[PDB]
Amino acid sequence: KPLEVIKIEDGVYLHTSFKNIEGYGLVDSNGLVVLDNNQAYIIDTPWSEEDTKLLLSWATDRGYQVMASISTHSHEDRTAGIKLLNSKSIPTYTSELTKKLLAREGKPVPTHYFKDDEFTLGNGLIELYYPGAGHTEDNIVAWLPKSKILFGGCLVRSHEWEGLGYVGDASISSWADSIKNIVSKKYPIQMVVPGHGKVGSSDILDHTIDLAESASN
Amino acid sequence: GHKPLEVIKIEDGVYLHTSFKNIEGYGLVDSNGLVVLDNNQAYIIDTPWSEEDTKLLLSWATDRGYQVMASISTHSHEDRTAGIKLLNSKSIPTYTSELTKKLLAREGKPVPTHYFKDDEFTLGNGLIELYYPGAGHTEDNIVAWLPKSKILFGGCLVRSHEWEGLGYVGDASISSWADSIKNIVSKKYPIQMVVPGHGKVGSSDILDHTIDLAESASN
Numbered sequence: 207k208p209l210e211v212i213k214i215e216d217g218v219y220l221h222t223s224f225k226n227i228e229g230y231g232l233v234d235s236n237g238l239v240v241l242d243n244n245q246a247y248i249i250d251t252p253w254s255e256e257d258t259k260l261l262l263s264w265a266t267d268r269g270y271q272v273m274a275s276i277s278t279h280s281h282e283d284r285t286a287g288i289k290l291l292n293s294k295s296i297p298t299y300t301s302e303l304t305k306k307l308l309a310r311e312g313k314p315v316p317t318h319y320f321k322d323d324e325f326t327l328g329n330g331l332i333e334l335y336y337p338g339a340g341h342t343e344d345n346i347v348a349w350l351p352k353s354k355i356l357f358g359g360c361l362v363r364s365h366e367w368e369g370l371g372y373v374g375d376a377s378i379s380s381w382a383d384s385i386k387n388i389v390s391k392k393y394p395i396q397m398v399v400p401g402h403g404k405v406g407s408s409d410i411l412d413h414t415i416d417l418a419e420s421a422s423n
Numbered sequence: 424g425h426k427p428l429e430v431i432k433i434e435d436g437v438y439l440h441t442s443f444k445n446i447e448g449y450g451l452v453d454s455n456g457l458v459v460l461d462n463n464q465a466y467i468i469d470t471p472w473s474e475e476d477t478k479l480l481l482s483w484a485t486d487r488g489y490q491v492m493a494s495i496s497t498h499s500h501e502d503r504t505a506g507i508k509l510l511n512s513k514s515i516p517t518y519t520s521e522l523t524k525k526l527l528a529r530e531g532k533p534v535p536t537h538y539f540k541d542d543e544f545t546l547g548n549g550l551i552e553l554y555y556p557g558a559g560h561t562e563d564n565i566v567a568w569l570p571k572s573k574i575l576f577g578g579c580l581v582r583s584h585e586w587e588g589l590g591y592v593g594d595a596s597i598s599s600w601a602d603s604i605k606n607i608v609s610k611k612y613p614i615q616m617v618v619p620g621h622g623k624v625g626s627s628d629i630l631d632h633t634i635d636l637a638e639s640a641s642n
């Protein structure tokens with residue numbers, strides 16, 4: 207089934223990609239599109255090239271210019287559309303580490319990267335922060351100061367889940383600390399968006415800390 | 424990155440087998456069946472999710488000196504039937520309901536060599552009791568009751584407490600699902616444990632949870 211895009215705040219839309227697993231059912235993956243006058247910014251590509259093309263059409267059919275994407279770690283559900291965005295001359299961004307992990311895997315790389323633990327896109331529309339290893343070594347989060355939404359990506363676990371999920375690339379013993387570094391920013395969080403599953407409140411941070419500590423033991 | 428079949432004992436003469444698929448950008452998803460033993464005779468309730476995992480389950484059994492007498496698949500979906508072709512190639516009897524068999528045929532998938540026509544059927548001389556309670560997860564889903572161990576294999580018609588919804592409903596009859604679960608209840612089996620098609624083994628409470636979720640999606 208195709209990409210779904212639904213409004214979750216003024217100028218903020220959740221995009222969800224799906225894969226249909228024979229014998230199991232549909233699984234899904236979230237990112238955001240953030241709108242500012244006539245400019246759009248994508249936080250995580252959709253999960254496939256085809257879905258990324260649908261996301262671009264969504265924006266441009268509405269008269270927006272897609273200014274940039276940012277991918278919040280190197281896995282395919284965050285980065286599948288980088289190649290397409292690059293082919294359309296849309297700036298793609300990741301952290302330096304994420305870029306280097308993609309390059310090391312022989313995957314298309316973003317055309318731009320940032321070196322520090324913090325970076326901003328869209329002149330403060332989106333504030334990126336690397337809190338430490340968790341779901342992966344390179345996972346970053348995005349804070350949207352206007353809408354008070356934290357896109358936690360795959361580092362955070364929605365309440366629908368009673369486990370950490372895939373941990374093949376995880377640093378389980380650092381994960382709780384990395385969430386605590388997010389808490390220490392004292393963002394006035396109204397909503398937290400996960401990489402997989404339903405939008406929640408700031409309590410998703412506590413839920414994740416607890417899943418992390420349990421797994422550590 | 425294939426993670427192999429896992430087999431774990433859950434009662435005397437009853438083993439849970441779990442197959443896994445590793446979905447890039449997501450992680451591992453899984454699917455359960457059973458192996459039920461009677462002396463050195465083994466019966467498979469649902470095949471593993473792939474040919475290779477079915478091979479591994481066959482090797483599990485034969486390495487332990489068991490003869491695999493038959494498999495029974497509890498509906499037509501791939502997670503229940505993937506191994507039918509391979510079992511057939513080794514002359515191991517494969518069973519489904521008549522409806523499941525015909526759905527497979529219609530889809531041009533490998534068909535079982537055996538099928539039962541009634542709403543009830545037994546394998547192994549009272550070892551496994553099969554019952555069709557009605558449509559739910561699919562039009563053809565059946566359940567298996569194990570008298571000796573007091574285990575109900577509910578397969579994908581039942582929802583573990585871990586799940587907040589009915590799951591995939593592309594092939595479902597949401598309106599009939601609660602009723603079908605009530606039909607199971609009406610059997611008055613002395614259930615000690617209920618095993619789902621996807622997720623953790625639980626207690627007879629799984630049935631009430633499923634009725635709840637069915638009613639809610641209906642409403």
Ligand SMILES: [Zn+2]
Nearest residue numbers: 279281341360
């Ligand atoms: Zn990931």
Ligand SMILES: [Zn+2]
Nearest residue numbers: 283360401448
């Ligand atoms: Zn993810």
Ligand SMILES: [Zn+2]
Nearest residue numbers: 498500560579
């Ligand atoms: Zn099914």
Ligand SMILES: [Zn+2]
Nearest residue numbers: 229502579620
């Ligand atoms: Zn199933």
